[PDB]
Every structure is written in structure tokens, then in C-alpha cells.
Coordinates of C-alpha atoms in Angstrom, one line a residue:
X1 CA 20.4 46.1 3.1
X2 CA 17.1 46.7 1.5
X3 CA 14.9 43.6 2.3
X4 CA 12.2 43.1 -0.5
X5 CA 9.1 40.0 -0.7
X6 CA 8.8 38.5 -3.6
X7 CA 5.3 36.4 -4.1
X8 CA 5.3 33.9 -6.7
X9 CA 1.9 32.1 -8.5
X10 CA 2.1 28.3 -10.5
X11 CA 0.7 27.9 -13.8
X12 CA 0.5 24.8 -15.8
X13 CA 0.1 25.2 -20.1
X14 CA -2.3 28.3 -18.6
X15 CA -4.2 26.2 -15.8
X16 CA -3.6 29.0 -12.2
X17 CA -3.8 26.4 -9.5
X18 CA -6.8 28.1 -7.5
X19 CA -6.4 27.2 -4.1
X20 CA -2.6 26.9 -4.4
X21 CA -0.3 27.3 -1.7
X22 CA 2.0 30.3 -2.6
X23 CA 5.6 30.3 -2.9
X24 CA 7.3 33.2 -1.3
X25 CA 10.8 34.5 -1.0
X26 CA 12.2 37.4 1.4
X27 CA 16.2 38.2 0.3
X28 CA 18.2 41.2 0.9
X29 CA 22.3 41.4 0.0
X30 CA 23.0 39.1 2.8
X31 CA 20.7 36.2 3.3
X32 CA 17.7 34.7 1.7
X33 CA 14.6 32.8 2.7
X34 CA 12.6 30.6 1.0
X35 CA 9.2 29.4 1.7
X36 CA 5.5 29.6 1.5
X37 CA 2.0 31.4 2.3
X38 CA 1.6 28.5 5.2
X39 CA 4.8 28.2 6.6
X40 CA 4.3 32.1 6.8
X41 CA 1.0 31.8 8.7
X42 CA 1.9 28.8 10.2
X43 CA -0.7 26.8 8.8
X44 CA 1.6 24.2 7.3
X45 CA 1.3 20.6 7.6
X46 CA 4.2 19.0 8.8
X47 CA 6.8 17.8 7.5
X48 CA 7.5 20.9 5.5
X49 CA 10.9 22.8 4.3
X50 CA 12.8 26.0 4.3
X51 CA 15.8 26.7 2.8
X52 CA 17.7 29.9 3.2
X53 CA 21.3 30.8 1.5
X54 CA 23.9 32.9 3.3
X55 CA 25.2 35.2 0.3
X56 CA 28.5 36.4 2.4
X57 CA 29.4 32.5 1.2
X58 CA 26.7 31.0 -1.0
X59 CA 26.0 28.6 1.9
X60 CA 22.4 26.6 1.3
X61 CA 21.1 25.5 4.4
X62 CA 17.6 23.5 4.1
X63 CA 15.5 23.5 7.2
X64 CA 13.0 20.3 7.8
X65 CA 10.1 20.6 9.8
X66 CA 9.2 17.2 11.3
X67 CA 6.5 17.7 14.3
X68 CA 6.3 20.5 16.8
X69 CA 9.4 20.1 19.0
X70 CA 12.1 18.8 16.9
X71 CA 13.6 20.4 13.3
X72 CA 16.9 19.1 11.1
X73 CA 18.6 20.9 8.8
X74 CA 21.9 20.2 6.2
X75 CA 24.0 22.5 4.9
X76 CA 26.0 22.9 1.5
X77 CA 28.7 25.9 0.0
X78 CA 28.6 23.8 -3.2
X79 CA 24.9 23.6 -4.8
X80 CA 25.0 27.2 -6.6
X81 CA 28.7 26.3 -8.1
X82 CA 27.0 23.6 -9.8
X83 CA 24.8 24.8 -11.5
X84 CA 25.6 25.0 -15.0
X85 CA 23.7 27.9 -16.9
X86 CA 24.1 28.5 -20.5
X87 CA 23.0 31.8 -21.5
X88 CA 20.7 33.8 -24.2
X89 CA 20.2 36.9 -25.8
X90 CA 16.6 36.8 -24.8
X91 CA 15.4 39.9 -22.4
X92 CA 12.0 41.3 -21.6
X93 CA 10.0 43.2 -18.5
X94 CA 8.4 41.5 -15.4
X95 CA 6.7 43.9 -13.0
X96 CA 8.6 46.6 -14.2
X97 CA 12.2 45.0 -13.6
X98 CA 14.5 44.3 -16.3
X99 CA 14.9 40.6 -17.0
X100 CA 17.0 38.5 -19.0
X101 CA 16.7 34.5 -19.8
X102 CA 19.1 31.7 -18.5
X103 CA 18.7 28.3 -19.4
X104 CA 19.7 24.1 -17.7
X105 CA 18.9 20.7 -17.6
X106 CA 18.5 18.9 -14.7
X107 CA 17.8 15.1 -15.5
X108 CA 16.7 15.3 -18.6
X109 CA 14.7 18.7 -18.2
X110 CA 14.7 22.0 -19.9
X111 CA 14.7 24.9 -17.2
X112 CA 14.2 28.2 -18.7
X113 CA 15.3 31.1 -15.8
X114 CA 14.6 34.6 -15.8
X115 CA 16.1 36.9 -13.9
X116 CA 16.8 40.5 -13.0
X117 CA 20.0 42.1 -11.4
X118 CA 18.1 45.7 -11.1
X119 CA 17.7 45.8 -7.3
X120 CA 20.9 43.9 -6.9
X121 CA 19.9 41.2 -4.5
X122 CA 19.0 37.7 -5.4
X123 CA 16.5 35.3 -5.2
X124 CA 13.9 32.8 -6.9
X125 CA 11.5 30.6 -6.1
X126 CA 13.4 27.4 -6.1
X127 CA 17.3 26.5 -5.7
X128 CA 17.7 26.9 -9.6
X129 CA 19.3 30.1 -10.7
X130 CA 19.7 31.6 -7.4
X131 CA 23.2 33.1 -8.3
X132 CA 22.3 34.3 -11.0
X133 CA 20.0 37.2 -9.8
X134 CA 16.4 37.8 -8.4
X135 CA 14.6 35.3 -10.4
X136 CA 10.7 36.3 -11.2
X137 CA 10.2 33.3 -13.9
X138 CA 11.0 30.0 -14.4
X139 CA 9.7 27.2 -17.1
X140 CA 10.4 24.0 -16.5
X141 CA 9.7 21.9 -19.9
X142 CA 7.6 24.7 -21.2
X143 CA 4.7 23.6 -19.8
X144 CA 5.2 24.2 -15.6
X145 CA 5.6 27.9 -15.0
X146 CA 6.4 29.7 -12.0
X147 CA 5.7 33.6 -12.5
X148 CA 5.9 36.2 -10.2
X149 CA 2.9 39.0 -8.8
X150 CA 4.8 41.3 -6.5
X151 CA 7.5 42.5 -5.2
X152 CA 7.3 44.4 -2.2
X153 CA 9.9 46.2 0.2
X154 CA 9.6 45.0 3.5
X155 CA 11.5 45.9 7.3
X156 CA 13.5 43.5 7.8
X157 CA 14.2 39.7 7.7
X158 CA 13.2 38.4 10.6
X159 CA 13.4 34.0 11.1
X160 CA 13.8 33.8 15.0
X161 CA 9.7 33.9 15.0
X162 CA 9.6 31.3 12.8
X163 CA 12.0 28.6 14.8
X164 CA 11.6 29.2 18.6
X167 CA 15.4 21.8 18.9
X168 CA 17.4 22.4 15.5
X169 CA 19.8 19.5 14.9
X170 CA 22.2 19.7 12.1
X171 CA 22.8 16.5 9.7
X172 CA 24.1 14.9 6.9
X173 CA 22.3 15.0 3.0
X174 CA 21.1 12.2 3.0
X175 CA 19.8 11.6 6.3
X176 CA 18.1 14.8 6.0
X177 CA 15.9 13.2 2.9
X178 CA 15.7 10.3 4.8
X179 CA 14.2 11.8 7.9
X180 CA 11.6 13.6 5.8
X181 CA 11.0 10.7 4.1
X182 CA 10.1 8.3 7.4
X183 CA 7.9 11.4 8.6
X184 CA 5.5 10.9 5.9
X185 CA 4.1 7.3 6.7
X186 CA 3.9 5.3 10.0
X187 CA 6.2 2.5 10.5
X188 CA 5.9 -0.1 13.0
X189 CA 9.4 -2.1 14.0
X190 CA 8.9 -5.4 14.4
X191 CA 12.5 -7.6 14.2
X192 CA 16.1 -6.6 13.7
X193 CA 18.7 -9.0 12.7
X194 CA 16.9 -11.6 14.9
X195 CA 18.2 -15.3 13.8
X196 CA 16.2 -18.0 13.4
X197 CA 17.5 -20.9 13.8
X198 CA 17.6 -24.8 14.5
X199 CA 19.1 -25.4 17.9
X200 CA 18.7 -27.1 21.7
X201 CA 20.3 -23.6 23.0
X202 CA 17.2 -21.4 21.4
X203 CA 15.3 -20.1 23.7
X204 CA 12.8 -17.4 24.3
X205 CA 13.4 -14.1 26.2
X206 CA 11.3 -11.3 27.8
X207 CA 10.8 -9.2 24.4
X208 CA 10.5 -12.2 21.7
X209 CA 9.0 -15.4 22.1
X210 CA 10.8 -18.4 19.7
X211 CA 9.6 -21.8 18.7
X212 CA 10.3 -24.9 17.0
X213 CA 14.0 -25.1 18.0
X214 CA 14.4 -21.4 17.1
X215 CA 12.8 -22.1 13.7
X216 CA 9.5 -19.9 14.8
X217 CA 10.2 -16.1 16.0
X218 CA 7.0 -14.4 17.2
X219 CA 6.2 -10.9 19.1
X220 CA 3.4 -9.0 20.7
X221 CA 3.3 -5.2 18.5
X222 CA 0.4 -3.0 19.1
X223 CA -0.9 -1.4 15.8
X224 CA -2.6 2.2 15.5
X225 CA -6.3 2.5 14.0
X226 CA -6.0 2.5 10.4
X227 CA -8.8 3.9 8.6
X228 CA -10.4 2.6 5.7
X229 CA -8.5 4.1 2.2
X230 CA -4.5 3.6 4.0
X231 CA -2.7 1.1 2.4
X232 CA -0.5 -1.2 4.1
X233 CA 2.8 -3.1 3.3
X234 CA 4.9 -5.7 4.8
X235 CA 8.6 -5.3 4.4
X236 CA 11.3 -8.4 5.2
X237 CA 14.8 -8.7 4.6
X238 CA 16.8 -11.6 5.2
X239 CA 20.3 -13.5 4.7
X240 CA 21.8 -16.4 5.3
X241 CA 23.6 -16.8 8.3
X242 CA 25.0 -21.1 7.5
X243 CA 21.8 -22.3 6.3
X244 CA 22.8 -22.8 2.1
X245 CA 19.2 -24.2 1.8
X246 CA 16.5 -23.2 -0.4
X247 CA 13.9 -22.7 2.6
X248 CA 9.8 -22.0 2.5
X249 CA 9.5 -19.1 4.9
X250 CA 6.3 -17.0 5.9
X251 CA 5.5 -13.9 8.1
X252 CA 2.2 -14.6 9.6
X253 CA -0.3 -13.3 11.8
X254 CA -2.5 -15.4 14.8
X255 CA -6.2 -14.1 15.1
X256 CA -7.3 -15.0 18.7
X257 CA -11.2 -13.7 17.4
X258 CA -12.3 -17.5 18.6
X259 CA -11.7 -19.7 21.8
X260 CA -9.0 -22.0 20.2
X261 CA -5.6 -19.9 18.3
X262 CA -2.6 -21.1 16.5
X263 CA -0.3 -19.7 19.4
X264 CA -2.7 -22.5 21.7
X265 CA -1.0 -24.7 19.5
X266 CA 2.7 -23.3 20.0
X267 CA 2.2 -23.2 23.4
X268 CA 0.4 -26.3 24.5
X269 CA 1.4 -28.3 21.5
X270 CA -0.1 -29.6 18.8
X271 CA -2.6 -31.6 20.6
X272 CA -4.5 -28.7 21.9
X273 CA -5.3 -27.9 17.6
X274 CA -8.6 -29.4 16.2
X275 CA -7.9 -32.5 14.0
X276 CA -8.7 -32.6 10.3
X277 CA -9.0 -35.5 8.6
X278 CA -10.0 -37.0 5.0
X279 CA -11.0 -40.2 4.9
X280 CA -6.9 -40.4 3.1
X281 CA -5.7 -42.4 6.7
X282 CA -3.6 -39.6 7.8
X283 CA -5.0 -36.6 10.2
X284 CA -3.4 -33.1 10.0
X285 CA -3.8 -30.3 12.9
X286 CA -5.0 -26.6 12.9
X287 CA -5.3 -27.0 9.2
X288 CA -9.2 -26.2 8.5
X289 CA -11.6 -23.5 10.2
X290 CA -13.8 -25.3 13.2
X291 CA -17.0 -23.0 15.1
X292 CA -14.3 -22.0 17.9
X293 CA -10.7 -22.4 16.2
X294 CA -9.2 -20.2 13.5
X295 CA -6.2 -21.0 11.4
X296 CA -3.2 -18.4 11.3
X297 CA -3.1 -15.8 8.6
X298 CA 0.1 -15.7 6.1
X299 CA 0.3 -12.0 5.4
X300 CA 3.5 -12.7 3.4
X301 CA 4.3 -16.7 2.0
X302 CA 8.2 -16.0 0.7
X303 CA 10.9 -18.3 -0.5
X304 CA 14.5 -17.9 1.1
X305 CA 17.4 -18.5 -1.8
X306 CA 20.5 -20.7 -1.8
X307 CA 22.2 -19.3 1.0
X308 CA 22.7 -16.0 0.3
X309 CA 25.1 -13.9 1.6
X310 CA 27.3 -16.3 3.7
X311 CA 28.0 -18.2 0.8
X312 CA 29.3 -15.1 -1.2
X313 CA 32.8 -15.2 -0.8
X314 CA 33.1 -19.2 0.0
X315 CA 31.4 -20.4 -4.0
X316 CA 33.0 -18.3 -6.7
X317 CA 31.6 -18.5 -9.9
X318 CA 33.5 -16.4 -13.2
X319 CA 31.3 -13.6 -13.7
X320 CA 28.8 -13.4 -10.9
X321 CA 28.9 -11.0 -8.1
X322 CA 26.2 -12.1 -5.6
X323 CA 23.5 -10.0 -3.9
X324 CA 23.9 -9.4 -0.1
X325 CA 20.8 -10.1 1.3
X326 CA 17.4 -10.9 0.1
X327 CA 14.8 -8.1 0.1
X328 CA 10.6 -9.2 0.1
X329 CA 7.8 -6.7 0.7
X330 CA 3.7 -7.6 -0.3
X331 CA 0.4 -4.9 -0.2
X332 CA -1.4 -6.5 2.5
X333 CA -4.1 -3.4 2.3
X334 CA -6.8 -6.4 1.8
X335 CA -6.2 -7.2 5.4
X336 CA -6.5 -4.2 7.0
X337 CA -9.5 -5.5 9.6
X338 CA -7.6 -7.6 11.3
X339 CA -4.6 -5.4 12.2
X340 CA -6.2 -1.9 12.4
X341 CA -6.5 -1.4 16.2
X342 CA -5.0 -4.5 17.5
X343 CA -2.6 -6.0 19.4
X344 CA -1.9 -8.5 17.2
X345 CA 0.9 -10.7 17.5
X346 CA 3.2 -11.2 14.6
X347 CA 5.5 -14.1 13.8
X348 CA 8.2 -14.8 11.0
X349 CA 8.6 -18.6 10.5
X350 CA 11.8 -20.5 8.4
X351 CA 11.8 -23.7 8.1
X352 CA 15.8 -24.8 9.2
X353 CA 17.6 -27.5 10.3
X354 CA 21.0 -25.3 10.5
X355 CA 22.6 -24.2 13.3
X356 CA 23.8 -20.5 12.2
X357 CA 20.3 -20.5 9.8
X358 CA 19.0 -17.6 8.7
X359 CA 18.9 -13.3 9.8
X360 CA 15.7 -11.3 9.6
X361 CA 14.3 -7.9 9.7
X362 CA 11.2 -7.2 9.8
X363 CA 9.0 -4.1 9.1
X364 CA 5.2 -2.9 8.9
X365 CA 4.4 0.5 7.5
X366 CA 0.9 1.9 7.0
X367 CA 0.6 4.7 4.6
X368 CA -2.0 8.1 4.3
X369 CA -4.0 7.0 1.3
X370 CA -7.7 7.1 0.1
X371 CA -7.6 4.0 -2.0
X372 CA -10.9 3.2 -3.1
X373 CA -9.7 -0.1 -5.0
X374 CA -9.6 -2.8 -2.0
X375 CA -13.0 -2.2 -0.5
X376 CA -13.5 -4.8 1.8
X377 CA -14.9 -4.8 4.8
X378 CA -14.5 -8.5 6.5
X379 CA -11.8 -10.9 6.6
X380 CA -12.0 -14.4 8.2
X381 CA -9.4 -17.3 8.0
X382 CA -10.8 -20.4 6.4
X383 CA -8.1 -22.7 5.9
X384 CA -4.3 -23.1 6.4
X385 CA -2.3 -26.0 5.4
X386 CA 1.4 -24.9 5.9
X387 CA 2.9 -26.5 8.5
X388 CA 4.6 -24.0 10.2
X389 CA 4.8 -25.8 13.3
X390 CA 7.1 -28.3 11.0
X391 CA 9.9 -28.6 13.9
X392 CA 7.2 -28.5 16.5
X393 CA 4.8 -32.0 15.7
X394 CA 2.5 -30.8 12.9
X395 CA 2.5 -32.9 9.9
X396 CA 3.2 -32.1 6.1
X397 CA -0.1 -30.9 4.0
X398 CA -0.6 -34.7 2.5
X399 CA -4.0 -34.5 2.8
X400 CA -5.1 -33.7 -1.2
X401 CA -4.0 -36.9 -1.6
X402 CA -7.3 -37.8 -1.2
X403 CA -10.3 -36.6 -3.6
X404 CA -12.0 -34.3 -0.6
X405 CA -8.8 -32.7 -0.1
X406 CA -9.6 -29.9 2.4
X407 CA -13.2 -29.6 2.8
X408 CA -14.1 -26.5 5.1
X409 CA -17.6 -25.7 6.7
X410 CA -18.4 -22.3 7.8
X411 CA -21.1 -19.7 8.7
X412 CA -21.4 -16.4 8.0
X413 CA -23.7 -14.0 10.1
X414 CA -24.6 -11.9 7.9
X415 CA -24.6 -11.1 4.3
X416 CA -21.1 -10.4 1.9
X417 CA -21.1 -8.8 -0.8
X418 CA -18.3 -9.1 -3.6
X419 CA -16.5 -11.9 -1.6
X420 CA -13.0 -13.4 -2.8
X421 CA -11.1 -15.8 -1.4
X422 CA -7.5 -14.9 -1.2
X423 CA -5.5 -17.9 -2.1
X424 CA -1.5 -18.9 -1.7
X425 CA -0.8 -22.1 -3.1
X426 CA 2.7 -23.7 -3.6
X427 CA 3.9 -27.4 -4.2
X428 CA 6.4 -29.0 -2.9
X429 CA 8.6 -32.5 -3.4
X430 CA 12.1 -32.2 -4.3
X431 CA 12.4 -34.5 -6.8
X432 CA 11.9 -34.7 -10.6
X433 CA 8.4 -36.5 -10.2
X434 CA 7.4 -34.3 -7.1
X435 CA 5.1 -32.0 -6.8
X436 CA 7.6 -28.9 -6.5
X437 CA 8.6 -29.7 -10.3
X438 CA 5.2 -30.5 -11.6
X439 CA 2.4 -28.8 -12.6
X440 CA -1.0 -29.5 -10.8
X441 CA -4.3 -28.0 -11.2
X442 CA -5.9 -26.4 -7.7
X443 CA -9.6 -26.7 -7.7
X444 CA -11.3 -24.5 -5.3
X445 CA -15.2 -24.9 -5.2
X446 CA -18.4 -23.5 -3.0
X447 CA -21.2 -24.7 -1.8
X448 CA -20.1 -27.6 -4.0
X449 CA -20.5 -25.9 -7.2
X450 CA -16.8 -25.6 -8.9
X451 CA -15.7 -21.9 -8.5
X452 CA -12.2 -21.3 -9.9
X453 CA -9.6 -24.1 -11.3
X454 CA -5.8 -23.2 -12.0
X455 CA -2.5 -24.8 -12.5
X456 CA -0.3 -22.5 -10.5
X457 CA 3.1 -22.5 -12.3
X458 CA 6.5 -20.1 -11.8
X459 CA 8.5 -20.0 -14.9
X460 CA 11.1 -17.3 -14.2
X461 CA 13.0 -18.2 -11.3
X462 CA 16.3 -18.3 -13.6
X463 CA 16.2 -14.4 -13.2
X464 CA 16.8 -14.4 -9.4
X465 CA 20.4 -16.4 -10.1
X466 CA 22.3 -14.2 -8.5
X467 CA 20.4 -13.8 -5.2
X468 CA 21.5 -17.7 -5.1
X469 CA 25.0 -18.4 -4.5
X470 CA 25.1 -21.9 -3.0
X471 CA 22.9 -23.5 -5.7
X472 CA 23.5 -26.7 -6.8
X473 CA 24.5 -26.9 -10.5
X474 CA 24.1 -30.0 -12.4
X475 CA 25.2 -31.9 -15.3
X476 CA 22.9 -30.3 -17.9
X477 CA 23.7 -26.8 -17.4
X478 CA 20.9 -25.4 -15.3
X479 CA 21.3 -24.8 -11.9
X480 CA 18.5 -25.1 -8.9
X481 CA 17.6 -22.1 -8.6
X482 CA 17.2 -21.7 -12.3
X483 CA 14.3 -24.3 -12.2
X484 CA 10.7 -23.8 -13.3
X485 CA 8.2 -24.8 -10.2
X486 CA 4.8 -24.9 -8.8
X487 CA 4.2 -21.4 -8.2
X488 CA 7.8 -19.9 -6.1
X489 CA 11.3 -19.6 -7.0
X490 CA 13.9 -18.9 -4.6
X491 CA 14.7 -15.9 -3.4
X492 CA 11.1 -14.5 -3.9
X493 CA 7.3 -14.0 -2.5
X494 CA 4.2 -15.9 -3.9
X495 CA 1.8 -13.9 -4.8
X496 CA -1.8 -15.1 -3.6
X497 CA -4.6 -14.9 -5.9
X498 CA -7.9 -13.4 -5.4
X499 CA -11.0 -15.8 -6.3
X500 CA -14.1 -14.0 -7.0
X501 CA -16.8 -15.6 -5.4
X502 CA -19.2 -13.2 -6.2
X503 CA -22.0 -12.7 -3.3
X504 CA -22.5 -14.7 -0.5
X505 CA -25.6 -15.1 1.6
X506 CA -25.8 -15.5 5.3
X507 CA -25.9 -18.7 7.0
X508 CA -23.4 -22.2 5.9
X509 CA -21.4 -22.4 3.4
X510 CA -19.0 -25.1 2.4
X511 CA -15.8 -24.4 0.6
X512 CA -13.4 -27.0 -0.6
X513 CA -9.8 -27.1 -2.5
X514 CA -9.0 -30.5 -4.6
X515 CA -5.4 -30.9 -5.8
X516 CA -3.8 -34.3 -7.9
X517 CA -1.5 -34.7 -5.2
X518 CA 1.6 -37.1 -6.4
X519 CA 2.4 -40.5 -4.9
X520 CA 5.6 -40.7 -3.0
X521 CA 8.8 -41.9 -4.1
X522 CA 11.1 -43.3 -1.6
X523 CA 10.2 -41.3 2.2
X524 CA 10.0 -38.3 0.0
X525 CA 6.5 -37.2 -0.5
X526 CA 4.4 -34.2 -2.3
X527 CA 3.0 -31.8 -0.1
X528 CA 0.7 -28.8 -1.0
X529 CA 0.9 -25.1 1.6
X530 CA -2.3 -23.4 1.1
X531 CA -3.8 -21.1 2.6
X532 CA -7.0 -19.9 2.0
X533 CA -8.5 -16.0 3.6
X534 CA -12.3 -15.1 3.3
X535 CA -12.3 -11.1 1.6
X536 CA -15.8 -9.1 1.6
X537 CA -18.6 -6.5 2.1
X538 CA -20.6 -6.7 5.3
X539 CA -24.2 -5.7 5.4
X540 CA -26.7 -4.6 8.2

């Protein structure tokens, strides 16, 4: 057996890569190995594969590289069979060996093979056409080519160098494994219930509040460098609760002398007092010179009860969604986590029993983003009421004109500041505030910077994600309902004010909203949340 090296070189319409990584292949009549110029040298970046095919049975077995001690690898008798060549009269000469042309589709592409039976081994530089001979050139869609430069004999296959903890798995775990190698992800829940009940009660690990309603932890998160990007995943089902529930993953920054998680612990005394002039007061809502509201990295909306009320409400030609997925870019945020031991929280309002399951996910990624440039990141103001089953009062306060009036100080100078904004209304009734439109008025320093009606107007395409909505007379069902900026079963995206440049020293910011009067004991409250965004200097 005759072992031969066959170097390959990428071309695209013309265009030699110059600095490209080539792909090499080292086959004799009994096995094959594919792989590449730095996986040779060992100058590969991990993860990184290998495949090599045991001709004596056409066995495929793909080798994944994940860090220095452990590798995985699948196997697979059936890929080569599979592959379904048609064939063409077309023939020609590639370093001197006698080819002739192949051709495929896979998904919709045009695969052109050549190969060459002259040595009588086999090979290529991918998977495709690997039965079929030594393969020296493929074209995928005419444009990608994949040509060969030598061929050279060699002593003899030798892998053992190459391996010196292999772990054989399944398809798709395999891609899966690769796949979670490529990005850090940092655990946070798993199934964890949140609930509403007397028996809820904190444990070594995970700290809950409210009656259960409030789930929060203490994760340690990794410097992240400026050009990551960073995502927030959640999923959650119903476990009793049918309702149609404002939840919110959130953050507590404990950058000042008074936190939010002072207020969970020591109640909501302990939070600075806001008040309007309205006759009402509200706590922890506005910024204060040694007190800073919680962050919302992700405001979401849970739906009718998904999941335990699949099988229980049948409705003719709706097969219901199992469980609820939400994930939001929180990249703009990245100065507050990167480096930190922050402590994360997921928050649903309840008043069920069974309630609600979670699972909870961060996950920062190698980018070099040069979009989201900022650089700062302070909390101005915060009006949802997380603490809802734990003394804090509903956001009531733009019932007056000064609504939520916030002074603050910068030390130094910001350039292209934004104010990232979440706004939804509530008031569950036809002339509440969750049903009709209001226009949000944020201004600074008193001038009138940005002025909105926030308005959803597609929350009949999350029906199915719903399956205890209440369906009324007309038609329409809950869930189906146009609203002040959610739907059910869905996040609310914030919006990003421009606020242009802001100098150092006080500034005032302020949000009006035309609150509604109340009906009966229902009322119309506004969660809103407000998050400085900017460019230090000096």
C-alpha cells in the first residue's frame, strides 16, 4: 500500500486565497486522512476536524478537536452510499493523472468532481466524491474551486502522533459539541419554578423572593473585551399559571451604597422614596447620588399558559407550541457584566401555585463588532415593580404632569449618549392603558428630546404559543389583541434615544406619559425603564 500526499489550493472566480490554510489529504488502499497545513504542524486553533475513512468498509469517522485533553469523534458506513453522482463524458489531465468529471447537488448546489482512478487509491479534499476515486478538482456552483498542486509519495500513514481522551458519540451531539466550543456560555437556571407560595423558600445555591415570584443568583462572568457581543437566552412554560404574565430577567448594580437586592432583603423601606406632587410615593423607582435602580437586560411577556394547557383546551386545527423561547443582544451592556460578579435575577409576576418553569442562559460570543461602541452605562430610572408581591407599588406615578423626573451627574464628558428605553402599558380593560395608545415623552435638561406612541400591532401571530386565551364574543381572542408595546408570548424591544453629546456635571432627565384614570380598583400603570448608553472621555 503505496501511501501518496495530495496538497490542495482554494480559488474563488480566479481570486488564490493568499494566506490560506491548505487542505491536505494522505490515502493509501486502506485508509484515508483528511486535514490541513495546521492541524499538520499543529498550529491549529481549536476546535478543529479530521475525518478519515476506513476503505476495507467505507467507514467515515470525523474526529473533533475541542481543547488540549479531550477529543470526540462519530462514525458512519452510510455517507459514501449516499451520495448520488450522475456522470459525464467530460475527461482531461491534472498533474499528469488522468481525470474524468462527476457531477451532484447538495441543497440546491451544483458540485462538479474530478477524479482519477490511475493510482488506484482514493481521496479528495472534502467528503464529496470520495468513492469515486482520488479527487484532484472540485467546483462547487462554478464559482468555488478546489484544485490540486501535488501529489507526492510518502512512507507511510502515520495518526498516532497526531492523537496522543477520544470519546465516541452520536451525529448530532458531535455538531453540537463543536458548536458550544465556539462561544462561552454561562448557566444560570434550569427548570427552576417560580412561583406564588407560603412554602417558597430560598436554598444555599438560589436565593427567591416575593413568595417564590423573584428567583435570583450570584454568577461570576469572564472579562469580555470590547467588539464580543452578548445575548440573553430564556425559555419558559407554564407550569398552572394560564395567565398572561409581565416577566423580566434583570440585573442589580451594587456600583452605589443603596441596591435593589437592599430592597429584597431589608424590604422596601430601606429603597429611596420618589414622589410627584400626584399624592402617591413609589420606591427604588428613580436614580438618587447613592442608590441605583436594577437593570432589565430582558423585559418579556409570558403567554396564556403555555404548555400545561395544551392538552386540557383543544381548539380544531391548532397544535400548540411547547414552551416559550425569548433571547435579546444585550452587547450595549457589556460594562456592567464584563468582569463581575454580578448577580442575576428572573422575575414573573404570579399568583399561582404551580406558576411558571424557567431556563436561563448567558452566552458571550468572539466578535469585533464595531457597531455598539459605548463605553459607559448607568441606570437612571426603573419603574417596574418587580418587587410587586413584596410591598412596592404599581408605576401610577405619570399620572401626574412631572411623571418621573430624574436628576443626575456625570463626571465627565459622553459622547454620542442614548438612553435605552423599555416602555409598556398596562390596565386590563378596554379603556386601560394596556389597550390604548399613549404618547411617552422623554426630555433633557428640560428641552423635549424624543416623543413616541409605543404600540404592538402583531400579537395575533403568536396565537399558538397561547393556548388558554380567553376567546370572546366577537371573534378575537386575548392574545390576538393590539397593545401598548408587548404581546404575549414575546420580548419588548427597548428603544435607543439619541441624546446626542452630553457634558459633564447635572443633568435632568424626565419621562411624561397621559396616564388613564382608573375604573373600578383597576388602574393604568406604565413599566419603564430607562439606561444611560455613551462614550467616556479623559
Amino acid at each position: 500500500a503505496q501511501t501518496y500526499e495530495i496538497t490542495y489550493q482554494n480559488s474563488f472566480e480566479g481570486k488564490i486565497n493568499p494566506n490560506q490554510n491548505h487542505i491536505i489529504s494522505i490515502t493509501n488502499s486502506d485508509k484515508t486522512l483528511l486535514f490541513n497545513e495546521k492541524i499538520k504542524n499543529k498550529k491549529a486553533d481549536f476546535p478543529f476536524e479530521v475525518n478519515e475513512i476506513n476503505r476495507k468498509n467505507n467507514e467515515v469517522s470525523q474526529f473533533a478537536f475541542l481543547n488540549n485533553n479531550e477529543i470526540v469523534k462519530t462514525s458512519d458506513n452510510t455517507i459514501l452510499a449516499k451520495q448520488e453522482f450522475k456522470p459525464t463524458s467530460e475527461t482531461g489531465k491534472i498533474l499528469g493523472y488522468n481525470v474524468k468529471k462527476a457531477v451532484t447537488s447538495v441543497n440546491s448546489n451544483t458540485i462538479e468532481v474530478w477524479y482519477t482512478n490511475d493510482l488506484k487509491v482514493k481521496g479528495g479534499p472534502s467528503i464529496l466524491g470520495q468513492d469515486l476515486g482520488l479527487v484532484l478538482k472540485t467546483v462547487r456552483n462554478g464559482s468555488s474551486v478546489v484544485e490540486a498542486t501535488s501529489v507526492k509519495k510518502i512512507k507511510a500513514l502515520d495518526d498516532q502522533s497526531l492523537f496522543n481522551n477520544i470519546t465516541e458519540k452520536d451525529a448530532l451531539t458531535y455538531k453540537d459539541m463543536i458548536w458550544k466550543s465556539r462561544f462561552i456560555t454561562i448557566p444560570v437556571f434550569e427548570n427552576e419554578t417560580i412561583n406564588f407560595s407560603d412554602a417558597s423558600k430560598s436554598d444555599q445555591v438560589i436565593q427567591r423572593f416575593g413568595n417564590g415570584t423573584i428567583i435570583l443568583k450570584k454568577v461570576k462572568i469572564p472579562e469580555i473585551k470590547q467588539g464580543n457581543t452578548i445575548f440573553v437566552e430564556l425559555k419558559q412554560k407554564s407550569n398552572g399559571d394560564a395567565y398572561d404574565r409581565t416577566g423580566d430577567v434583570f440585573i442589580i448594580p451594587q456600583e452605589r451604597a443603596i441596591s435593589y437586592y437592599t430592597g429584597l432583603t431589608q424590604g422596601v423601606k430601606s429603597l429611596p422614596v420618589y414622589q410627584n406632587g400626584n399624592g402617591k410615593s413609589y420606591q427604588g423607582v428613580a436614580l438618587t447620588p447613592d442608590y441605583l435602580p436594577f437593570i432589565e437586560l430582558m423585559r418579556f411577556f409570558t403567554p396564556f399558559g403555555i404548555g400545561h394547557f395544551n392538552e386540557k383546551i383543544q381548539l380544531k386545527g391548532k397544535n400548540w407550541h411547547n414552551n416559550t423561547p425569548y433571547r435579546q443582544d444585550i452587547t450595549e451592556l457589556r460594562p456592567q457584566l464584563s468582569g463581575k460578579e454580578i448577580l442575576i435575577g428572573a422575575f414573573i409576576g404570579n399568583y399561582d401555585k404551580g406558576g411558571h418553569q424557567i431556563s436561563l442562559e448567558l452566552s458571550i460570543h468572539p466578535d469585533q463588532q464595531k457597531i455598539v461602541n459605548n463605553n459607559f452605562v448607568l441606570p437612571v430610572f426603573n419603574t417596574t415593580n418587580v418587587m410587586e408581591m413584596a410591598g412596592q407599588d404599581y408605576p401610577t406615578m405619570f399620572n401626574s404632569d412631572k411623571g418621573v423626573e430624574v436628576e443626575f451627574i456625570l463626571t465627565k464628558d459622553l459622547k454620542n449618549a442614548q438612553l435605552r428605553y423599555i416602555t409598556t402599558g398596562h390596565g386590563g380593560w378596554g379603556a386601560g392603558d394596556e389597550f390604548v395608545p399613549k404618547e411617552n415623552s422623554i426630555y433633557l435638561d428640560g428641552k423635549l428630546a424624543h416623543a413616541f406612541t409605543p404600540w404592538r400591532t402583531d400579537c395575533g401571530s403568536y396565537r399558538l404559543f397561547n393556548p388558554a386565551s380567553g376567546n370572546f364574543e366577537d371573534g378575537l381572542s386575548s392574545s390576538d389583541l393590539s397593545r401598548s408595546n408587548w404581546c404575549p408570548g414575546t420580548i419588548t424591544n427597548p428603544v435607543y434615544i439619541n441624546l446626542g453629546n452630553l457634558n459633564a456635571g447635572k443633568h435632568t432627565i424626565q419621562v411624561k406619559i397621559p396616564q388613564g384614570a382608573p375604573e373600578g380598583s383597576s388602574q393604568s400603570f406604565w413599566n419603564v425603564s430607562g439606561v444611560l448608553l455613551g462614550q467616556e472621555h479623559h
